[PDB]
Structures are given as structure tokens and as C-alpha cells.
């Protein structure tokens, strides 16, 4: 399985945040 922070690696790279968003900083 996997257990990260919020739940999974969502606070890193799940779908939305590729970097921050991706090109724009957010």
C-alpha cells in the first residue's frame, strides 16, 4: 500500500501538484 502525509502522496504529486501546480507557482 502507501501511507504518506494527508493520506497518500497528495501533498507532493497525485494529479494537481505536478511541481507546485505545474508551470505557475501556487
UniProtKB/Swiss-Prot annotation:
Its primary physiological function is unclear. Has cytoprotective activity against internal or environmental stresses. May play a role in neuronal development and synaptic plasticity. May be required for neuronal myelin sheath maintenance. May play a role in iron uptake and iron homeostasis. Soluble oligomers are toxic to cultured neuroblastoma cells and induce apoptosis (in vitro). Association with GPC1 (via its heparan sulfate chains) targets PRNP to lipid rafts. Also provides Cu(2+) or Zn(2+) for the ascorbate-mediated GPC1 deaminase degradation of its heparan sulfate side chains. The normal, monomeric form has a mainly alpha-helical structure. The disease-associated, protease-resistant form forms amyloid fibrils containing a cross-beta spine, formed by a steric zipper of superposed beta-strands. Disease mutations may favor intermolecular contacts via short beta strands, and may thereby trigger oligomerization. Monomer and homodimer. Has a tendency to aggregate into amyloid fibrils containing a cross-beta spine, formed by a steric zipper of superposed beta-strands. Soluble oligomers may represent an intermediate stage on the path to fibril formation. Copper binding may promote oligomerization. Interacts with GRB2, APP, ERI3/PRNPIP and SYN1. Mislocalized cytosolically exposed PrP interacts with MGRN1; this interaction alters MGRN1 subcellular location and causes lysosomal enlargement. Interacts with KIAA1191. This protein is produced by a bicistronic gene which also produces the major prion protein/PRNP from an overlapping reading frame. It is linked to Found in high quantity in the brain of humans and animals infected with degenerative neurological diseases such as kuru, Creutzfeldt-Jakob disease (CJD), Gerstmann-Straussler syndrome (GSS), scrapie, bovine spongiform encephalopathy (BSE), transmissible mink encephalopathy (TME), etc. Belongs to the prion family. This is Major prion protein. It comes from Ovis aries. The gene is PRNP. The chain holds residues 145 to 169 of 256 of the full protein.
Amino acid at each position: 500500500g502507501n501511507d504518506y502525509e494527508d493520506r497518500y502522496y497528495r501533498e507532493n504529486m497525485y494529479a494537481y501538484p505536478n511541481q507546485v501546480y505545474y508551470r505557475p507557482v501556487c
